[PDB]
């Protein structure tokens with residue numbers, strides 16, 4: 001042995017299951033490094049993650065990429081470490097103490113992730129798996145990470161993201177407005193941060209949201225903000241705002 005991994009980095013802890021928090025011996029900084037079994041169609045998919053990061057490195061609201069390499073039966077990617085953990089962990093803690101993101105904090109989240117998404121989309125890519133466990137926290141700063149489902153906007157083939165966040169047209173394999181799939185998952189992401197119950201994976205409550213009905217939110221929001229979220233989940237993708245229209249919205 002003597003991995004590049006072993007020799008260039010000191011591993012501190014496992015943070016995801018694998019992803020490790022690591023100090024780079026030479027530069028003194030902390031990075032998150034994912035080590036996955038090297039895969040083929042499964043390899044094409046793994047390399048899109050790398051090609052996506054290598055073009056999505058210049059934005060404040062997308063997690064930065066440093067390097068990627070292969071050794072053994074393993075593939076490695078070294079990203080920016082985000083010391084605030086994921087939004088899914090923040091939301092789960094808030095659930096427990098019954099104190100949620102307040103309206104101003106939900107607007108900040110929506111606008112920051114909105115701007116990462118605007119950038120992603122102006123590179124003719126779509127993220128395809130927007131959800132709280134793929135938003136990282138670092139002013140709070142929210143950064144989109146986990147680019148493993150990224151594809152080009154006009155892709156005829158798509159790997160679908162988490163079903164709790166998945167828009168119906170993508171499930172029906174109508175990929176004509178893929179960017180609006182990211183808009184749909186971002187609304188539901190903000191609904192979780194606001195304090196809603198866990199989203200359903202299927203069944204009758206899944207279809208109700210997909211009819212355009214907001215899950216119940218245990219706090220009082222302005223009619224305006226609520227209107228914006230509702231239109232972000234409209235069953236007709238053409239009605240949802242683009243990320244461009246979103247970051248320039250009056251409500252934000």
Ligand SMILES: COc1ccccc1-c1cc2c(c3c1C(=O)NC3=O)c1cc(O)ccc1n2CCCO
Nearest residue numbers: 015016032033034079080081082083085086133146
């Ligand atoms: C190479 O890393 C990845 C490669 C591909 C996909 C995701 C990650 C990932 C996971 C990640 C964190 C961080 C990243 C990242 O790219 N930058 C981070 O900072 C991070 C930071 C943290 O403070 C606590 C937990 C945690 N996880 C796992 C949790 C997943 O929900």
